[PDB]
């Protein structure tokens, strides 16, 4: 095992455990100290204003198992500190018959048991577990724990009748899944159900959704309501909130609804952020965010989706969320988005970016797997004065359209996503910022033009505004993590409406994934404009490439170039001519970003362990 | 619910939980503070000379489940003190994937991990578990924990490769069971195997047996040897120590070997107690004690047995224990005998006496189930100068015979059992002792003759020596827990060699068992004697009746008379005449015994709880 990054990589499978720990590792984002991580969980803003973030964690292993809550906190979403207790950075772990198979995803009741922050989580026990298996009742239940020390530790309710688990009966037979309880308050749903509370007797101020589906018949999001305010044991099943068909797709802009939901949440937004009105705010929109499984050929069969919904009240005192329009939260290698309320009328969302090493070839050599996305403010994106000649505008696929009185302009509404401003300010202020001169890409443009200032390492951000002619057939974008021999190309092609990440040359190491990423982006053309504009921002963070377009489209992916000098960046141009010109302006490079874990040393590996021959006997976890 | 014990019992199933807690409860023996108990476990003499006793425990329930080690200690086997920690009187409980289904029976390595007392125990996980089910590998494994505070708490080794569980591979396929590891030192087995240690590489000073069997092919006791002295992770399977046939019986004196062994142990005894020689002591005998299942029509299909064995060394460096003669450790409602070494060359044995409420009719009303037997010294019982005309003497069924040179007398050898002298001394010294006049039972004997002094409550001991003619057809014995309307009759019938306990009138409460208990007793006739003698001792302790005959035969059973005055005792006589006389002498009543738990109040119930609907979903425990 040579770690010489000035020559071609050897056979890196001969390298020892965690010998590649720092090589490709993100530094500017949320990531576990070591080992396996997946979904964010237990997210809440604490009483002191700081953010508590949990995550599905399996320390000292590089595959999933014994899944536990790891945790950390931050005053600004950006610089983090690990909890450190009797179980290291873990704060909840399998310990009881009802959760011994795994402490799955859960969410926070901020004023819960005895007034303390309380987590409702999926407690898993023995038996087949999965949407393509014959799962039985009891294997996935929902349980409570509360914290008296602001998340340093959690105390579970006792096992038994009238205690944990608190939700265990399946609401319908033959479920594909029954997990990821999302607890939320909703003046909107309270107002809608107020006339029906005699029917169900559920009058509490908290709601909870549970994610799943029905065998052969598509995904389901099940709605529960807390039975009585101030009491947390009894949750009354109302009915299915979202019902979709077996591998139903709303279309090209909307992924696929698969066979089963995971990590679903419910929110209400307006143009400024979170909306806490009862329906009276006409600018507010109800949204559901959700993962789907087995509706995709790649990306581990997973889509992270969202839908704008219109609520209808059923005669039995339940709510049907009718999908109005439907989109994608991130088009790349990310999943398990969780959102939570933040002071100042914000709803903040964060997901999990998985690696691109599906065959587990270098996972032990890394000594870790997984990271978070950046934290994102959600809001209703509104585009005014949209030209009706915008191609495809009235499909209304992942957006709504509203005509002006005279029919000559349109107001477009969709889900907005942007990186939280605390992170952008910290990144910029800690970086070496280079403000670059605008560039016209014409007949003289090379295929690749390096920026006049270059990154110094694999931790940087780029931004640029690309102005295209309305009938362009040119392509443009950014190349990142680039040397002569390795590079990753981010292209936008307005004629096809496709944002792609081409990774055929991303790395000399052939075991990592090299498939092309794709997102659809609609450039809403403005009345009177003779051009259309793509604002593209890219974060490069170790192996993470996280792309944002027009505060709307997100695409997270991975690139693992071997060579030490594969860090460069610049502009891409294809089919630009004297007549078909792409104007690039607002160009800026931020080199360095932020050290997101200042108390951590560079190498926080504690080694890896094997569970031994019993792992295969129990059959629950891979064991490593 | 009336608790008026001066009138007939009502419908006692209407009584609340633990309302009958003190009514039938033993006071003079080892018993849990409340709830379910079964097998003794983790027995050892601590460094200060006190005795540590563990037991299978399920607090606040009256059926088995979440099975844990409850524990207590005593300086004299007789007066006990509960441990009290974070889990009350529990000291080991299900907590890890490998033991979450139950912390089953285990035994003590006195100088174990880091020099501390260490328990090797059966750690159980998910799946079918039982001799009549299709159990798989992993469901029962063997794990270590050690104590740094003399049994107040135990620390388990970590889960994983080279740690817990330490024994998990099945030594043969299709096992009926794989549990109850019994760890022991044996100069005898070391000496026998010394010439074969090149074959196996196992040279440690501890051995361990694991109890089980093979589907369709009878029970097995598997022998392991510690691989290396001072190291406790690696245990090398040598081979089957005891192999018996599917429901094989050695005969009427020997119970039945069933289909599977439980709680088996290995010891070496001589006439004084424990023998620690290497084979050089010609008076010493190797014994195996073991439970068998599914070889009995009643008594919950369980026999607690023992066998004298002769060890043979196999060519592969293992030991075959060849059964020389085979007997019964207790003929009544007891099981799960554990034995352990005690200073002064003693081996002490103790078992579990179950209730006689198989249909679970009044278990909740009790608020507890189960107790221990008394603690018993084991030794080789030797009877000299036995007459060869003793009927059946040369069947050698549960004994051996050795002729004198002249063939006119015989030395009989068998397993001896007697109550530990510490308990007998404490019982007698704390009791009101009545020494009774000898009685000849002849033509004038009533069927029942009360003793001249009577017990004052349900806590007493009796003793008597019954002298019979060599061709008697008379019967005699003791009646206990007796009023006019309720009584329990203990008879010996020398013509049939049957000691019986007739329980047809034991209680007015009809839900308790009333079947007749039976033990075989051989009266070894002495050369020149014109009579044969039965020394019979009976302990009455709440509902326990525990009978000992000739320091050899033990029979534990239950009687639950309702009436407050059903406490009397006296002599029984049947078919005694002027010519067929039974002489009774050495008669003594000890009224009161000892309060075995002086720190406990009378009612130590903490109520009962239900596990809720998930108990049936998981399917592992009854849930109450
Ligand atoms: C199989 O058997 C298993 C083992 O028995 C069993 O698991 C056990 O289940 C029981 C029963 O559910 C659990 O008991 C509960 O424990 C809760 C506390 O849990 C936390 O703390 C304990 C104890 O912590 C001490 O000890 C440890 C270990 O040494 C130390 O690390 C600690 O520092 C601490 O040490 C101090 O105290 C020691 C003695 O206790 C001293 O020795 C020492 O010197 C120190 O001073 C921990 O062990 C727990 O850890 C475990 O669990 C966590 C998850 O929770 C895991 O992460 C971890 O790995 C461990 O597994 C944990 O940290 C108690 O709160 C709880 O008691 C409440 O509930 C019951 C009702 O069920 C009531 O009877 C009781 O009165 C309590 O309720 C009151 O309190 C709260 C307020 O605090 C109220 O919400 C409630 O309404 C009520 O209020 C009352 O009082 C109010 C105020 O006065 C009043 O106003 C009200 O009106 C009202 O009257 C209960 O005891 C036990 O933790 C489990 N143990 C383990 C190891 O798992 C398992 O379930 C069984 N399985 C099956 C299938 O049956
Ligand atoms: C799924 O995830 C689960 C959760 O992660 C996981 O379970 C956990 O597994 C890990 C790994 O196996 C366990 O970690 C071990 O813990 C042992 C100690 O266990 C006891 O103590 C802990 C901690 O107790 C503190 O905290 C609790 C809780 O607050 C308090 O109640 C205590 O009072 C105590 O508090 C003090 O300390 C705190 C911080 O630690 C402070 O906050 C506080 O202020 C106090 O000061 C308890 O939690 C344990 O309870 C649990 O387990 C018991 C059963 O054991 C249950 O009954 C109970 O209900 C709980 O479930 C328990 O009481 C450690 O000894 C052990 O560390 C040794 O082993 C590892 C090797 O594996 C070494 O890395 C390490 O160095 C240690 O080895 C050395 O030490 C011993 C000597 O002591 C030697 O034998 C050994 O050779 C070695 O010696 C070294 O040092 C020598 C001297 O210097 C030197 O000479 C030698 O040469 C050598 O170098 C390890 O940390 C963890 O307990 C589990 N936790 C739980 C909750 O279950 C589960 O396995 C996972 N499942 C799967 C399927 O993967
Ligand atoms: C005395 O001790 C017992 C523990 O043994 C305490 O708890 C009770 O245990 C018994 C089992 O011994 C439970 O009986 C079972 O009940 C279920 C149905 O229960 C439902 O209906 C009840 C009647 O109103 C109700 O009390 C229950 O409410 C509890 O449970 C829910 C969770 O489901 C929880 O949310 C509540 O807060 C309560 O904790 C519940 O709604 C029944 O299906 C079982 O039937 C089987 O067994 C019986 C007997 O053989 C048989 O007849 C059936 O055919 C079937 O085989 C079983 O009857 C009882 O529910 C428990 N009660 C509780 C927890 O309140 C009991 O509390 C102790 N008493 C006191 C005064 O302390
Ligand atoms: C690096 O990190 C790993 C954790 O990932 C550390 O532990 C090793 O993990 C790997 C899995 O990643 C284990 O590989 C498996 O090994 C078994 C066979 O193991 C046996 O033979 C080994 C070779 O000598 C030996 O080391 C093992 O000894 C350990 O385990 C026993 C208990 O069985 C215990 O008593 C000992 O004390 C040791 O702890 C053992 O005897 C093999 O069956 C597995 O095969 C599967 O997977 C591979 C890979 O896909 C495949 O090729 C097979 O076809 C099959 O699919 C697997 O190879 C390895 O055994 C673990 N080694 C240990 C625990 O020592 C590792 O230690 C870390 N290294 C360092 C230097 O820290
Ligand atoms: O829910 C997202 C799907 C997903 C994606 C990758 C996984 O992750 C990787 C990425 O290459 O694939 C491997 C699993 O085959 C895993 O070792 C690795 O971390 C995974 O466990 C779930
Ligand atoms: O291993 C001894 C067999 C045995 C005997 C009785 C049991 O015990 C009793 C006694 O009536 O039977 C009942 C089980 O049906 C149990 O509630 C009760 O304690 C038991 O669980 C195992
Ligand atoms: O770590 C768990 C969290 O990860 C999520 C989101 O990816 O997916 C469940 C993944 C999963 C794990 C084990 C299985 O047997 C299975 O079929 C699917 C959540 O649904 C969940 O709470
Ligand atoms: O509490 C356990 C201890 O009790 C013993 C002795 O009676 O028997 C096992 C009883 C048993 C429990 C659960 C089962 O599924 C089963 O088939 C038998 C031991 O073998 C053991 O360690
Ligand atoms: C980068 O490193 C490679 C390999 O060491 C070298 O060939 C190349 O000239 C370097 N510089 C580049 C590609 O700009
Ligand atoms: C790389 O090394 C592995 C052993 O880890 C070996 O199996 C594989 O064939 C090697 N690949 C080569 C030499 O290309
Ligand atoms: C309410 O009605 C809906 C629509 O038929 C149904 O799916 C749901 O199960 C009902 N809720 C109940 C029975 O609680
Ligand atoms: C909206 O405007 C477009 C363009 O003028 C027109 O084709 C369409 O019919 C209008 N829709 C409505 C509902 O008026
Ligand atoms: C650098 O980042 C830190 C950590 O997020 C932040 O608090 C600080 O304000 C930043 N420095 C600037 C903007 O100068
Ligand atoms: C015992 O009590 C019963 C019922 O109260 C009574 O009939 C009887 O006379 C009493 N004394 C006896 C049986 O010696
Ligand atoms: C005793 O009470 C139970 C209720 O616990 C009842 O079912 C049974 O029939 C009663 N037996 C009688 C009255 O004999
Ligand atoms: C014993 O105590 C328990 C628990 O407090 C109580 O429910 C029960 O009625 C008591 N029984 C007696 C006989 O005092
Ligand atoms: C040793 O031989 C015996 C007798 O055939 C056999 O039962 C046992 O399994 C053998 N031991 C091994 C293979 O370790
Ligand atoms: C033992 O003694 C009996 C009675 O004298 C006799 O029948 C038997 O043959 C003797 N056995 C041996 C082995 O000498
Ligand atoms: C009474 O019993 C106690 C407890 O076992 C014992 O220590 C004491 O010696 C006994 N009293 C006597 C024999 O007088
Ligand atoms: O096909 C869209 C035709 C059209 C309708 C109204 C407009 O204002 C427009 O610019 C184009
Ligand atoms: O049947 C036993 C005959 C017998 C042999 C030797 C004796 O010493 C005896 O008393 C009887």
Give how far B617 is from chain A: nearest CA, Å: 5
**Closest approach atom of ligand 18 to CA B401:** 1
Interval between CA A76 and ligand 13 midpoint (Å): 9
SS3 of residue B195 by DSSP: helix
Structure tokens that stand for B139 in this block: 């469901």
Q: Is the CB of B522 within 6 Å of ligand 8?
A: no
Boundaries of domain holding B37:
1-428
The residues of A whose Cβ lies within 8 A of any Cβ of B are 66, 94-95, 97-98, 100-101, 125-126, 136-138, 141, 159-163, 165, 168-169, 609-614, 617-618, 620
Whether B143 and B179 share a structural domain: yes
DSSP state of A592: S
Considering the domain architecture, whether residues A79 and A118 belong to the same structural domain is answered as yes
In this complex, do A163 and B612 lie within 8 Å of one another by their Cβ atoms?
A: yes
**Atom 7 in ligand 19: residue holding the nearest Cα:** B426
The alpha carbon of B175 is separated from its chain's Cα centroid by a whole number of angstroms, namely 25
CA angle (A456, A457, A462) in 5-degree steps: 80
**3 state SS of A188:** helix
Does residue A610 line the site of ligand 4, with CB under 6 A?
Answer: yes
DSSP B218: -
Q: How many CB pairs under 8 A join A and B?
A: 69
Ligand 20 atom 9, closest CA:
A388
Domain boundary among B376, B409, B428: B428
Q: Sign of dihedral through CA atoms B352, B355, B356, B357? A: negative
CA angle B496, B497, B501 (to 5 degrees): 95
Pocket test for ligand 4, best of A60, A610, A614, A623 (most atoms within 8 A of CB): A610
Residue pair A97/A108 in contact (Cβ under 8 Å)? The answer is: no
Q: How far is A226 from chain B (nearest CA, A)?
A: 20
Q: Please, which residues have CB within 8 angstroms of residue A589's CB and are 6 or more apart in sequence?
A: A433, A434, A436, A451, A453, A454, A455, A460, A461, A462, A569
- Interface test with chain B among A61, A95, A97, by most B beta carbons within 10 Å: A97
Does the beta-carbon distance from B161 to A610 stay under 8 Å? yes
Name the one residue in this structure whose structure tokens are 């003698």: B533
Across A185-218, the runs of DSSP E, i.e. the strands, are: 207-214
Q: Which two tokens stand for residue B568?
A: 């009397």
A214 & A298 share domain: yes
- Asked whether the beta carbons of residue A161 and residue B137 sit closer than 8 angstroms, the reply is no
Task: Report the residue of chain A nearest B65, measured CA to CA.
Answer: A97
Query: CB of A49 within 8 A of CB of A154?
Result: no
| Pair (A421, A462) in one structural domain | no
B618·A126 Cβ contact <8 A: yes
* Structural domains in chain B (count): 2
Q: How far is B608 from chain A (nearest CA, A)?
A: 11
Instruction: Indicate if B370 and B328 belong to the same structural domain.
Output: yes
Alpha carbon distance A281, B590 (integer Å): 88
State in Å: Cα B79 to ligand 1 middle: 30
CATH code: domain of residue B587? 2.60.120.560
Q: How many CB atoms lie within 10 A of CB A194?
A: 11
Cα separation, A134 vs A127, whole angstroms: 9
- What resolution in Å is listed for this PDB structure? 1.9
Is residue A325 located within the same domain as residue A295? yes
Q: Report the DSSP pairing between strands A368-369 and A35-45.
A: parallel
Report whether A177 contacts A110 (CB < 8 A).
Answer: no
Neighbours of A176 (CB within 10 A): 25
Please tell me the experimental approach by which this structure was elucidated: X-ray
Burial label for B298, CB within 10 Å (0-12, 13-18, 19+), is exposed
Q: CB neighbours of A606 closer than 8 A, spacing ≥ 6?
A: A33, A34, A59, A60
Please say whether the beta carbons of B7 and B566 come within 8 A: no
Sign, CA dihedral A419-A423-A427-A429, equals: positive
With tokens 């599977």, the residue in question is B260
- If asked whether residues A64 and A79 sit together in one domain, one would say yes
Interior angle at CA A439, CA A438 and CA A442, nearest 5: 155
> Tokens in use for A219?
């995904």
Same domain, B401 and B435: no
Cβ separation of B169 and A613 shorter than 8 Å?
A: yes
* Whether the Cβ atoms of residue B491 and residue B474 lie closer than 8 Å to each other: no
Closest C-alpha among A620, A238, A286 to residue B138: A620
**Cα(B381)–Cα(A595) distance, rounded to whole angstroms?**
79
Structure tokens at B280: 């050089």
Contact A138 B614 (CB under 8 A): yes
* CB within 8 Å of A164: residues ≥ 6 apart: A96, A98, A123, A143, A144, A156, A157, A158
Q: Give the CA radius of gyration of chain A.
A: 24
Q: What is the 3-state secondary structure (H, E, C) of A535-583?
A: EEEEEEECCEEEEEECCCEEEEEECCCCCCCCCEEEEEEECCCCCCCEE
The answer, yes or no, to whether any atom of ligand 12 lies below 6 A from the CB of A403, is yes
A181: closest CA among A104, A250, A236? A104
Residues A489, A456 share a domain: yes
What distance in Å separates the CA atoms of residue A252 and residue A398, rounded to the nearest whole number?
A: 10
Looking at the structure, tell me whether residues A403 and A450 fall in a common domain: no
Q: DSSP 3-state helix, strand, coil percentages of chain A (rounded to 5)?
A: 5, 45, 50
Ligand nearest to the CA of B394: 18
CA distance A162 to chain B (A): 7
From B428, B461, B480, the end of a domain falls on B428
Residues B402 and B439 in one domain: no
Which pair of structure tokens corresponds to residue A196?
A: 């029906």
Terminal C-alpha separation, chain A: 22
d(CA B550, CA B307): 19
Beta-carbon contacts of residue A95 (< 8 Å; ≥ 6 apart): A156, B95
Tokens of A332: 């790349």
Same-domain pairing of A419 and A453: no
DSSP bridge pairs for B519: B499
Compare all CA atoms of chain A with the CA of B618 and give the residue at the minimum distance: A138
- Distance between CA atoms of residues A39 and A372, nearest Å: 8
- Nearest-Å Rg of the Cα atoms of chain B is 24
Query: Taking CB atoms and an 8 Å cutoff, what residues of chain A touch B144?
Result: none
Rounded Cα–Cα distance for residues B553 and A277 (Å):
82
Alpha-carbon distance of B466 to B583, in angstroms, equals 6
Distance separating alpha carbons of residues B566 and B563, to the nearest angstrom? 5
Residues facing A273 on adjacent strands:
A270
Atom 67 of ligand 3: nearest residue by CA position: B609
* Domain end (from B393, B428, B463): B428
Binding site listing of A for beta-D-fructose: 38, 64, 105, 179-180, 262
CATH assignment at residue A333: 2.115.10.20
Smallest CA-to-CA distance from A530 within A471, A464, A474 is with A471
Provide DSSP, B247-316: T----TTS----SEEEEEEEEEEETTEE---SS--TT-EEEEEEEEESS-SSGGGEEEEEEEEEEEE-TT
The bound ligand whose nearest atom lies closest to the alpha carbon of A390 is 20
The closest-lying atom of ligand 18 relative to the alpha carbon of residue B403 is: 1
Sign (positive or negative) of CA dihedral A207, A208, A212, A215 = negative
DSSP 3-state of B280: coil
Token representation of residue A485: 């021999």
Distance from CA of A300 to the nearest CA of B (A): 28
Q: In angstroms, rounded to a whole number, what is the distance separating the alpha carbons of residues B252 and B496?
A: 12
The 10 Å Cβ neighbour count of residue B469 is 16
Count of CA atoms in the C-beta half-sphere (13 A) of A27 = 22
Are B138 and A163 within 8 A, CB to CB? no
Instruction: Report the distance separating Cα A590 and Cα B194, nearest Å.
Output: 75
């Amino acid at each position: 095992c040579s770690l010489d990054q000035t020559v071609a990589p050897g056979n890196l499978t001969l390298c020892g455990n965690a010998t590649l720990f720092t090589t490709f590792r993100p530094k500017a984002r949320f990531i576990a100290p070591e080992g396996w991580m997946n979904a964010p969980m237990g997210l809440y803003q604490r009483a002191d204003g700081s953010i508590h973030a949990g995550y599905q964690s399996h320390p000292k292993h590089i595959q999933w198992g014994n899944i536990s809550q790891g945790a950390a906190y931050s005053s600004d979403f950006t610089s983090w500190t690990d909890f450190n207790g009797s179980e290291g950075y873990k704060t909840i772990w399998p310990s009881q018959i009802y959760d011994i198979r795994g402490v799955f995803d859960g969410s926070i009741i901020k004023e819960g048991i005895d007034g303390y922050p309380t987590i409702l989580y999926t407690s898993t026990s023995f038996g087949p577990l999965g949407a393509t298996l014959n799962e039985a009742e009891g294997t996935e239940t929902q349980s409570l724990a509360y914290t008296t020390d602001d998340g340093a530790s959690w105390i579970k309710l006792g096992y038994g009748a009238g205690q944990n688990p608190v939700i265990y009966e399946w609401p319908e037979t033959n479920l594909t899944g029954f997990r990821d309880p999302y607890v939320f308050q909703s003046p909107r749903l309270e107002a809608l159900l107020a006339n029906t509370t005699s029917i169900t007797n559920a009058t509490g101020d908290h709601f909870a959704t549970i994610s799943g589906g029905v065998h052969g018949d598509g995904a389901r999001l099940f709605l529960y309501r807390q039975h009585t305010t101030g009491e947390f044991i009894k949750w009354t099943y109302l009915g299915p909130l979202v019902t979709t068909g077996y591998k139903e797709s709303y279309g090209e802009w909307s992924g696929n609804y698969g066979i089963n939901f995971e990590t679903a949440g419910v929110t209400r937004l307006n143009p400024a952020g979170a909306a806490w009105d009862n329906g009276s705010d006409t600018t507010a929109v109800d949204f559901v965010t959700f993962g789907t499984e087995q509706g995709r050929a790649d990306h581990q069969n997973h889509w992270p989706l969202w839908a704008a919904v219109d609520y209808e009240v059923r005669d039995n005192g339940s709510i049907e969320a009718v999908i109005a329009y439907s989109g994608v939260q991130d088009w790349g290698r990310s999943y398990a988005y969780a959102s939570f309320p933040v002071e100042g009328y914000r709803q903040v969302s964060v997901g999990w970016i998985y690696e691109d090493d599906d065959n587990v070839i270098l996972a032990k050599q890394f000594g870790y797997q997984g990271a978070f996305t950046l934290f994102r403010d959600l809001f209703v994106k509104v585009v005014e004065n949209v030209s009706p000649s915008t191609p495809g505008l009235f499909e209304q696929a992942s957006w709504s359209t509203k005509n002006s009185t005279d029919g000559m302009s349109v107001t477009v509404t969709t889900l907005g996503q942007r990186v939280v401003p605390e992170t952008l300010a910290a990144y910029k202020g800690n970086s070496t910022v280079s403000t670059l001169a605008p560039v016209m890409l014409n007949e003289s443009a090379a295929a690749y033009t390096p920026f006049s200032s270059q990154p110094t390492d694999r931790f940087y951000a780029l931004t640029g505004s690309f102005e295209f002619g309305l009938n362009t057939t040119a392509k443009a974008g950014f190349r990142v993590l680039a040397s002569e021999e390795e590079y990753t190309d981010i292209w936008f092609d307005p004629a096809s409406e496709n944002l792609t990440v081409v990774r055929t040359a991303s790395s000399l190491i052939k075991s990592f994934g090299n498939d092309t990423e794709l997102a659809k982006v609609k450039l809403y053309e403005i009345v009177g404009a003779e051009s259309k504009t793509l604002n593209l921002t890219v974060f490069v963070d170790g192996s993470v490439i996280e792309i944002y377009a027009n505060d709307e489209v997100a695409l997270s992916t991975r690139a693992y170039p071997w060579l030490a000098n594969s860090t460069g960046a610049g502009l891409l141009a294809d089919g630009t001519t004297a007549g078909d010109v792409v104007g690039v302006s607002g160009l800026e490079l931020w080199d360095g970003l932020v050290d997101a874990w200042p108390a951590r040393p560079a190498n926080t590996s504690q080694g890896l362990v094997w569970d031994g021959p019993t792992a295969a006997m129990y059959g629950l976890f891979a064991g490593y």
